[PDB]
Design a protein around this ligand. Structure first.
Ligand code: HRH
Length: 92
């Protein structure tokens, strides 16, 4: 992943906007740096991820699972994560 990806400007679709508003101030347009931070905070605050979970995020009974279309995923597959995120936003 190039560092430049973090500067991408994005407009979240409603379901992503719903999640983002649960952990941070509502903007219409974000950087990817912002979207990633807020998703990370959503995950951690809801303890969907911990050390000794084998790098797995568990999100089956959750808004995140709806967004991502998976019951769980590895925090190690960065490319796959970006893909799951982009299906819920529009680039600016
Ligand atoms: C920010 C974030 C968001 C989401 Cl959805 C998942 C993981 C993270 C985050 C993360 C965590 C906790 C915050 C859940 N633990 N390990 C990692 C990791 O590598 N992360 C990460 C950072 C930059 C780009 C990508 Cl692609 C990442 F997947």
């Amino acid at each position: 992943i190039p560092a430049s990806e973090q500067e991408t400007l994005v407009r979240p679709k409603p379901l992503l906007l719903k999640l983002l508003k649960s952990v941070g101030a509502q903007k219409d347009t974000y950087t990817m740096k912002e979207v990633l931070f807020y998703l990370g905070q959503y995950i951690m605050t809801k303890r969907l991820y911990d050390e000794k979970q084998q790098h797995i995020v568990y999100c089956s009974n959750d808004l995140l699972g709806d967004l991502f279309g998976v019951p769980s995923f590895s925090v190690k597959e960065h490319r796959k994560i970006y893909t799951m995120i982009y299906r819920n936003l529009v680039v600016v």
